[PDB]
Amino acid sequence: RFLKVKNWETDVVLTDTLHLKSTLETGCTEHICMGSIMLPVRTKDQLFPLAKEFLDQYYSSIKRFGSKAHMDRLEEVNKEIESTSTYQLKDTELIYGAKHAWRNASRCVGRIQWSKLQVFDARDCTTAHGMFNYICNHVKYATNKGNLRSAITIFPQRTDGKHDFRVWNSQLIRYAGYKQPDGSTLGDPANVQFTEICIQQGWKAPRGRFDVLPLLLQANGNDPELFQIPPELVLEVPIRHPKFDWFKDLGLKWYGLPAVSNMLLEIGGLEFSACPFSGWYMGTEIGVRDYCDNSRYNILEEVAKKMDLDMRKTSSLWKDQALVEINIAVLYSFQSDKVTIVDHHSATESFIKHMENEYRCRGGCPADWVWIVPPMSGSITPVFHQEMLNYRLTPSFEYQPDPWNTHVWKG
Amino acid sequence: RFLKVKNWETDVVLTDTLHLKSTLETGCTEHICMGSIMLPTKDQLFPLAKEFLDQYYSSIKRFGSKAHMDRLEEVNKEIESTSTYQLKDTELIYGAKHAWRNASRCVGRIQWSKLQVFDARDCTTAHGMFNYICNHVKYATNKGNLRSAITIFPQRTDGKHDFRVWNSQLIRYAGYKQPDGSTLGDPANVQFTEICIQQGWKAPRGRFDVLPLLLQANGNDPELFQIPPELVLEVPIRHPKFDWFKDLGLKWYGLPAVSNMLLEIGGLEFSACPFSGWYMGTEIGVRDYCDNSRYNILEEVAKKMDLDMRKTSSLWKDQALVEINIAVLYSFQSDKVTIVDHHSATESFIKHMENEYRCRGGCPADWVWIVPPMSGSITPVFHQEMLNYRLTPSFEYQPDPWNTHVW
Numbered sequence: 052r053f054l055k056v057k058n059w060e061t062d063v064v065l066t067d068t069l070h071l072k073s074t075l076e077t078g079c080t081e082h083i084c085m086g087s088i089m090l091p092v093r094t095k096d097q098l099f100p101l102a103k104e105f106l107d108q109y110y111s112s113i114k115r116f117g118s119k120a121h122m123d124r125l126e127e128v129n130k131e132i133e134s135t136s137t138y139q140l141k142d143t144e145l146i147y148g149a150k151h152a153w154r155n156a157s158r159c160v161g162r163i164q165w166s167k168l169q170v171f172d173a174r175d176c177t178t179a180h181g182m183f184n185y186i187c188n189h190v191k192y193a194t195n196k197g198n199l200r201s202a203i204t205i206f207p208q209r210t211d212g213k214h215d216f217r218v219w220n221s222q223l224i225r226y227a228g229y230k231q232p233d234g235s236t237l238g239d240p241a242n243v244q245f246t247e248i249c250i251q252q253g254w255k256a257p258r259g260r261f262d263v264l265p266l267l268l269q270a271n272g273n274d275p276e277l278f279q280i281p282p283e284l285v286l287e288v289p290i291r292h293p294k295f296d297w298f299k300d301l302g303l304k305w306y307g308l309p310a311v312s313n314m315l316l317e318i319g320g321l322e323f324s325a326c327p328f329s330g331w332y333m334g335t336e337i338g339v340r341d342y343c344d345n346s347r348y349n350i351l352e353e354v355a356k357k358m359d360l361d362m363r364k365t366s367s368l369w370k371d372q373a374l375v376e377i378n379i380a381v382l383y384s385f386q387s388d389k390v391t392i393v394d395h396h397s398a399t400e401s402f403i404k405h406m407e408n409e410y411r412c413r414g415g416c417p418a419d420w421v422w423i424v425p426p427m428s429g430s431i432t433p434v435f436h437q438e439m440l441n442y443r444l445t446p447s448f449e450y451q452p453d454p455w456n457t458h459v460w461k462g
Numbered sequence: 463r464f465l466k467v468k469n470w471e472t473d474v475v476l477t478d479t480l481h482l483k484s485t486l487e488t489g490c491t492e493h494i495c496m497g498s499i500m501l502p503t504k505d506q507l508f509p510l511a512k513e514f515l516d517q518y519y520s521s522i523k524r525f526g527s528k529a530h531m532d533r534l535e536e537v538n539k540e541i542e543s544t545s546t547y548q549l550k551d552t553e554l555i556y557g558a559k560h561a562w563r564n565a566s567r568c569v570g571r572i573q574w575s576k577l578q579v580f581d582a583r584d585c586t587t588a589h590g591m592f593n594y595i596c597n598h599v600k601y602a603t604n605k606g607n608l609r610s611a612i613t614i615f616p617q618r619t620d621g622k623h624d625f626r627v628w629n630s631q632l633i634r635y636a637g638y639k640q641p642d643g644s645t646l647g648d649p650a651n652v653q654f655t656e657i658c659i660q661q662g663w664k665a666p667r668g669r670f671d672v673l674p675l676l677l678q679a680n681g682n683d684p685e686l687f688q689i690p691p692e693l694v695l696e697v698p699i700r701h702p703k704f705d706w707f708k709d710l711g712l713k714w715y716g717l718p719a720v721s722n723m724l725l726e727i728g729g730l731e732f733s734a735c736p737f738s739g740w741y742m743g744t745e746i747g748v749r750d751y752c753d754n755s756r757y758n759i760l761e762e763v764a765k766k767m768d769l770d771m772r773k774t775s776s777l778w779k780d781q782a783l784v785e786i787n788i789a790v791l792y793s794f795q796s797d798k799v800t801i802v803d804h805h806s807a808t809e810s811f812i813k814h815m816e817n818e819y820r821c822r823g824g825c826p827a828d829w830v831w832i833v834p835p836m837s838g839s840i841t842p843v844f845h846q847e848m849l850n851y852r853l854t855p856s857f858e859y860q861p862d863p864w865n866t867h868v869w
């Protein structure tokens with residue numbers, strides 16, 4: 052069965068057949084849409100179908116479907132599963148797998164870049180210290196002195212789920228936050244809980260507004276250990292505004308490398324539970340969400356103050372006014388320092404073109420509108436007017452519970 | 463099956479039980495989410511009627527009472543005979559108010575229980591419909607102190623006797639494309655603005671030309687009528703800071719009044735049912751003025767602001783968009799015409815959601831439509847998980863008359 056999506060701005064219609072190859076389930080039914088819900092160990096029995104499915108895709112993409120090499124590989128994975136209850140991916144398979152997961156990520160506006168991903172294979176890693184080493188090379192390579200490059204590092208897959216590799220950090224680089232006894236937060240409120248663990252694990256806290264957290268790393272199901280990213284490796288950008296000279300005196304800066312480290316890469320039924328990946332920022336991620344969410348740095352008040360806006364009635368749109376100024380400043384700061392960044396008009400325009408192309412070549416592009424539309428200026432970007440279909444393909448990135456909620460402490 | 467929703471800005475958690483009473487379908491399956499898609503007999507009539515009368519009698523705490531059963535009985539008899547039935551006034555009022563209460567795409571529902579219902583079921587002609595509509599407009603407008611209202615024309619019968627209002631809103635500006643290539647006035651209304659001339663309207667050939675009402679009673683060819691200009695309240699748009707703003711010569715009408723929808727009560731189809739309330743600011747400033755296939759004034763306003771229009775990253779569109787929206791709010795407020803800003807309306811709807819969770823056990827809401835088209839993440843609805851499902855009574859879309867009416 053075929054499906055059509057329409058663009059309401061341009062009247063362009065497209066046709067999805069790709070949703071037919073859809074394995075996983077959405078959370079919705081005929082009677083309920085869960086489209087805005089934030090969050091919607093394997094036996095051999097369930098493993099071999101998922102293995103075969105994946106290897107069938109892999110072998111079409113290299114145009115060797117049904118080849119002797121396709122058949123032998125199947126045969127060999129089969130054997131290894133019945134013998135060992137799991138299997139190992141070839142290098143090329145891991146590469147293709149990680150690229151496809153990104154490509155299938157329906158919540159990512161950045162997917163035009165999907166085919167340029169530097170995959171680091173850290174499947175020989177055995178210790179935390181090893182993890183730290185791999186991650187440092189990740190950070191340095193992806194940073195590339197401000198000329199950011201997409202990359203991901205892949206640690207050893209789950210086995211019995213008692214020997215997990217995890218990167219406790221949600222991102223490799225993120226600022227501390229510290230709840231004060233008067234109730235106010237210093238630094239990033241998003242990171243309070245994780246900062247406390249870090250403190251607990253013996254991290255000595257500088258207790259400033261922009262302290263970079265230490266990596267907290269678990270190998271082979273062991274207790275996690277702390278490590279300090281070398282600060283020479285952490286690219287940061289001081290936030291100034293092109294016209295507003297007082298802007299710099301707000302004391303704000305942000306780091307340049309967005310690197311998500313808490314998700315799970317599923318490839319052919321294998322679970323890679325530490326797979327930190329990184330790209331570059333869309334301006335709004337910092338300027339709208341990081342600075343301006345009420346449960347984050349929440350600088351709207353102080354920026355609006357300094358702008359002397361009328362703050363006495365919301366109807367003055369003073370909140371909206373400051374929000375724009377702050378995003379102007381984020382883009383200007385990064386561009387001035389030659390650190391890769393993309394604005395939301397440009398990101399969304401690019402994505403429309405990716406999506407169209409994806410329909411042409413692939414028969415579809417799963418896309419989550421709730422997440423693809425930017426958190427400011429929604430309707431003046433072309434994605435707002437784009438109908439999208441959301442469905443789950445593997446390989447894929449999935450969420451996983453926070454490790455402190457599930458970890459068996461060794462002491 | 464007892465579902466939770468979380469606010470991620472406040473950690474507030476509500477449990478939804480109301481979705482279990484869902485009678486309509488979404489477009490979504492286990493395998494595909496369609497959340498972002500704009501438009502996805504005696505027999506079936508009795509259950510629909512029963513289900514409706516059941517909620518009615520329950521709402522007035524007379525569930526399973528004498529009066530309840532008798533009514534079920536009476537409606538049963540009438541169906542058996544006439545192949546339809548008629549709603550009592552009280553039911554009609556409940557039906558409409560509830561159709562609005564169940565509108566998952568509407569942010570303005572905190573107001574749902576104060577809808578003024580005008581029973582136009584006794585109407586028989588376009589002139590009649592015109593008269594009923596003018597009274598609606600005048601009552602609703604109320605000199606700027608806008609009031610919610612809906613006017614209900616007769617229900618569908620055999621579906622060749624349909625009452626329809628061909629306009630998509632009662633009050634909308636004409637659109638005509640010119641030899642030059644582009645468009646004058648409002649590009650959304652081009653096709654209809656033609657159907658009006660292709661029907662005999664002389665057009666004042668201007669921008670903000672209020673279009674003629676085009677009315678269809680009992681299935682007949684539809685007829686033209688000009689709403690007395692004195693009944694169309696308009697607001698000249700100016701900026702509280704920028705005096706050149708007014709020189710763009712922009713105005714907007716005060717009365718948003720949707721007129722092409724179909725209202726379904728207890729299986730009955732009210733296909734002419736224009737309803738109106740008041741504007742949230744962004745509807746005009748973000749959508750009407752700034753959409754590319756609408757008035758598209760951003761490029762023009764940005765100029766007068768002397769912004770850097772060289773590169774997308776100066777956020778000039780965004781900068782302008784805010785000022786425009788300041789100007790709309792400012793003007794309406796100055797002229798004491800009712801209007802609500804997106805911050806206030808979303809705060810109100812969060813409050814409404816609260817209310818509905820504890821009083822009704824839930825509140826269907828379509829996130830894609832509830833979050834405003836600007837400044838999304840700084841309004842509280844952005845961070846609010848919503849569950850979307852279809853309840854009844856309801857408003858529903860229906861095909862453009864001209865594609866359908868037998869001429």
Ligand code: HEM
Nearest residue numbers: 153156158159160161164201328329330331332333336448
């Ligand atoms: C090229 C630079 C990139 C940009 C500008 C970009 C943009 C984004 C943005 C704006 C979001 C929504 C995040 C939010 O606002 O909360 C997102 C989500 C996502 N992105 Fe991309 N992205 C990029 C690279 C990548 C890479 C390299 C991967 C993995 C290989 C990736 C995978 C995802 C995933 C899995 C999500 C969903 C997160 C979730 O479900 O919580 N992104 N991306």
Ligand code: HEM
Nearest residue numbers: 562565567568569570573610611737738739740741742857
């Ligand atoms: C009180 C002032 C009101 C405000 C501020 C309000 C606000 C809104 C907004 C912002 C939308 C999304 C529309 C768009 O962007 O195109 C909306 C849609 C809707 N509203 Fe309300 N509304 C109000 C009164 C009413 C009344 C009186 C009714 C009916 C009695 C109603 C029923 C609907 C319906 C049925 C839709 C969209 C239907 C669809 O597309 O499926 N609204 N309204």
Ligand SMILES: Cc1cc(N)nc(CCc2cccc([C@@H](O)Cc3cc(C)cc(N)n3)c2)c1
Nearest residue numbers: 089090161309310311328329330331332333336
């Ligand atoms: C609070 C919260 C709740 C929840 N249920 N899920 C989440 C995860 C969502 C998320 C949060 C921050 C950063 C990203 C990331 O997606 C940010 C990112 C990553 C990459 C690689 C590139 C880029 N431009 N941006 C994703 C967060």
Ligand SMILES: Cc1cc(N)nc(CCc2cccc([C@@H](O)Cc3cc(C)cc(N)n3)c2)c1
Nearest residue numbers: 500501570718719720737738739740741742745
């Ligand atoms: C182009 C298009 C195509 C399509 N298939 N559907 C639509 C959506 C239908 C719609 C359009 C404009 C305004 C409203 C209305 O929702 C606008 C409105 C109505 C009321 C009563 C109050 C208020 N504040 N605002 C509804 C649009």
Ligand SMILES: C[C@H](O)[C@H](O)[C@H]1CNc2nc(N)[nH]c(=O)c2N1
Nearest residue numbers: 435436437438498499500830831
């Ligand atoms: C494609 C997308 O579904 C469509 O543009 C929707 C999105 N959200 C909307 N939200 C509102 N309030 N009004 C709209 O017209 C739309 N349009």
Ligand SMILES: C[C@H](O)[C@H](O)[C@H]1CNc2nc(N)[nH]c(=O)c2N1
Nearest residue numbers: 087088089421422844845846847
């Ligand atoms: C409730 C809702 O799902 C949630 O607040 C979402 C909405 N859209 C988003 N979109 C992006 N890009 N990032 C987010 O964190 C969110 N949060």
Ligand SMILES: [Zn+2]
Nearest residue numbers: 079084490495
């Ligand atoms: Zn859905």
